[PDB]
Write a protein that binds this DNA or RNA. Sequence first.
DNA 1: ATCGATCGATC
DNA 2: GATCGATCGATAAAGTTTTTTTT
Lengths: 594, 55
Amino acid sequence: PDAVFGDRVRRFQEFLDTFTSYRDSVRSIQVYNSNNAANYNILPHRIIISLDDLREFDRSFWSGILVEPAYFIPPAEKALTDLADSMDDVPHHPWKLSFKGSFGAHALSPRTLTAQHLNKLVSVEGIVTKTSLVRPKLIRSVHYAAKTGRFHYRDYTDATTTLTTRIPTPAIYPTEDTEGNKLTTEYGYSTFIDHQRITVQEMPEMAPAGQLPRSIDVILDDDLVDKTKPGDRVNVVGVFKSLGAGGMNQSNSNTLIGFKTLILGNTVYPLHAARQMLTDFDIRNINKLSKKKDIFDILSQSLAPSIYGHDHIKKAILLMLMGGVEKNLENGSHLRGDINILMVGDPSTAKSQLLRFVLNTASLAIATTGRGSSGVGLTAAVTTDRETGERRLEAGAMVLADRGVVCIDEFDKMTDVDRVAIHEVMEQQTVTIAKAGIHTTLNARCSVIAAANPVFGQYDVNRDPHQNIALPDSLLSRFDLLFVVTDDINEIRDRSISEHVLRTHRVTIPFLRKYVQYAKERVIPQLTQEAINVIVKNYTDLRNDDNTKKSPITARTLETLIRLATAHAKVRLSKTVNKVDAKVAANLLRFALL
Amino acid sequence: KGPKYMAMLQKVANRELNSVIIDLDDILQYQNEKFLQGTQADDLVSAIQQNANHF
DNA sequence: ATCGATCGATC
DNA sequence: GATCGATCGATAAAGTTTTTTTT
Ligand SMILES: Nc1ncnc2c1ncn2[C@@H]1O[C@H](COP(=O)(O)OP(=O)(O)OP(=O)(O)O)[C@@H](O)[C@H]1O
């Protein structure tokens, strides 16, 4: 390599000013790895070259990285490895790149392919839904002759070097080298690496409807494994690459494609459209916005700026979405620290409107729509052979609902399969099944949001208020709040309605989502010896006034009456259970029961 | 009651149990009482978990 | 990649 | 004509959730 190395050589003296600002960063991350591990009684090798600093004073060295990125990456590795030992070697893994920056119109949505930038750089976004296995793989073993006591050294290349077209080495353990020594190999002195195949869908909103969502796939490496949950808005960028032999294999390969498009990539980025950083300024404003004695009322009407009223409902959603704690019993069954509300209403009264705008501020809570299929909380042994001979229990919809919220529609308009499905997973936090394989108790902290319609028209006043839809009352007993939405005619109400549907054809949301996702990580009081005294007076009267009124209650309803006020103090962001929380919890039930 | 791992070696040759136990406390105390002898003694618990199967 | 069968060359 | 050696060709893979009428 003489002439193919001089521009590689010229880069080695060039970009040392580009990491004038990173030559500290490359060594400072590993001196504490030489100090955490030496004093136990941890980070990968990630070197974020900004594209700006390379673009700012180089053109020919820059232009090749977006035209022919197949001769130019093991240059930048080769300078980088010798600037690690020459920095630090005295205390007694090639430091590959990450390559973040901007790109200038390479946001190819994989519904579209390339015709010109094949084998180039490409930025790709979307959602992943495949999440296949994890499995190690060698790169190099170290043979050893026991007789004469001397080692050997051999590398085995694969489709993981990403750029060079190496002659493959399909050998597993080449034994008996040119000697008479029965060979050994110190596998602890060997080295290994892993693979993970994941397919990415299309974000199904900016793809115009003339096709179903397509998909491609990406092979990544050790640094970013177990990072992507199924259901994350991910952003990845790597090289484009074809492999395999096709079309001109030995015989009879007619009308068979032979170029598997792959991506060998880096820098998997989550996005939000957990990463929400905040300075001292905005964290102090929410302390200043924790100060007033009205913030539970201001946050209620600042949520859905299209619909009038229902402030009992509008407080309930924000009370539910932030959620309450579950103190797990030591050597005992934890109770239902989740909360599960329900709605029902005579039709076209926005009972389904507010169920889907919670999904925009979901904070990684992707819900379904409730289609009559088994798979709501199971797998039913879908394996697809897991690349020829492995069986996996691929999770349907409970790997996503953990510490999140879901919502489903048309409860009464289902078959019998979901009725036994929501039976177990409500009284029990988990599910366990051996469909065709093994029992496995995988856990899930989830909470439903319901919606249903009464069958017999406008009959919610002339008949029994209970037994009203006759879906099994085990679920009615396992839920608490059954709001009956009224739509009676008031001549000032509909007059006010008539203008608010006209002024919608043209204190804020991102501050709201930051508030709850900061208040999910602070303290939990649970304790005031007199706030617990007022609520039992506030229950035993209606425990004697349950059959003399419309609805009978149960003993588990007492666990609601702590749980609502428990999260109501989380709105206050205080380590004390106050007294004022035992007044909102009273009258909210008093509207749900009278 | 001398070399106790050799004492367990006697209770196997007469064929009543086929499991010896070469633990680490009989290696570190073997190195604790080799701390005072100022000679080059390489680390043992390293190599038996740097590459365990050659032991 | 390994094993078996067939063909060719040499003794 | 028979035996031995070398070269070329052939041989190994796996299943069990949606949907129809029907009782
Ligand atoms: N009570 C209401 N106040 C204000 N707007 C309303 C109300 N009810 C309906 N709307 C308007 O109706 C539109 C959509 O209503 P929506 O489709 O959610 O009814 P729905 O809840 O689906 O009824 P159902 O679930 O019975 O079909 C919204 O744009 C909303 O502005």
